[PDB]
């Protein structure tokens, strides 16, 4: 029989991750691109900051120490305009306490994750080693048209 593998989805899309555990640095002012709309395969836009820049981030609080192995991301098609948006690359920030934040590194420099080439398909990125964290931040670095984000995290809880 199949043994357990640390690579299960942690709650986005599912629901195990509550609306209250998702937040952002900001959000688009019209209210139609909130952080709660960044769940993978959501059909109501996604998350968009108030200003498109590489200082914005989407944040998820796992509420418990958790093994984190991979991140999946999509852009989003605007429900209102049929326009497509997506993040093309991002950095990852993690934290056990929500105040001391480490930018994920590969070697001496920040790992820059390559992300999406369209607004519909899922791009999965694995970490080169599972990381034990409670807070995760996705901070885009490049994007097509504008930042728009749907997300899933993979792992297991200790």
């Amino acid at each position: 029989g199949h043994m357990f593998q640390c690579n299960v989805p942690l709650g986005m899309e599912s629901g195990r991750i509550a609306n209250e555990q998702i937040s952002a640095s900001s959000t688009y002012s019209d209210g139609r691109w909130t952080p709660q709309q960044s769940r993978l395969h959501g059909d109501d836009n996604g998350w968009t900051p108030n200003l498109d820049s590489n200082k914005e981030y989407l944040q998820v609080d796992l509420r418990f120490l958790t093994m984190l192995t991979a991140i999946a991301t999509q852009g989003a098609i605007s429900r209102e305009t049929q326009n497509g948006y997506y993040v093309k690359s991002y950095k990852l920030e993690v934290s056990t306490n929500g105040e001391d934040w480490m930018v994920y590194r590969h070697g001496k420099n920040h790992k820059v994750f390559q992300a999406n080439n369209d607004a519909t398909e899922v791009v999965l990125n694995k970490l080169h080693a599972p990381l034990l964290t409670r807070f995760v931040r996705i901070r885009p670095q490049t994007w097509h048209s504008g930042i728009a984000l749907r997300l899933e995290l993979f792992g297991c809880r200790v």
Binding site: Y28, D30, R32, W33, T48, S78, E80, T81, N83, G146
Partner: peptide, 5 residues
């Protein structure tokens, strides 16, 4: 009338 995102 507000260009929509």
């Amino acid at each position: 009338r507000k260009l929509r995102r």
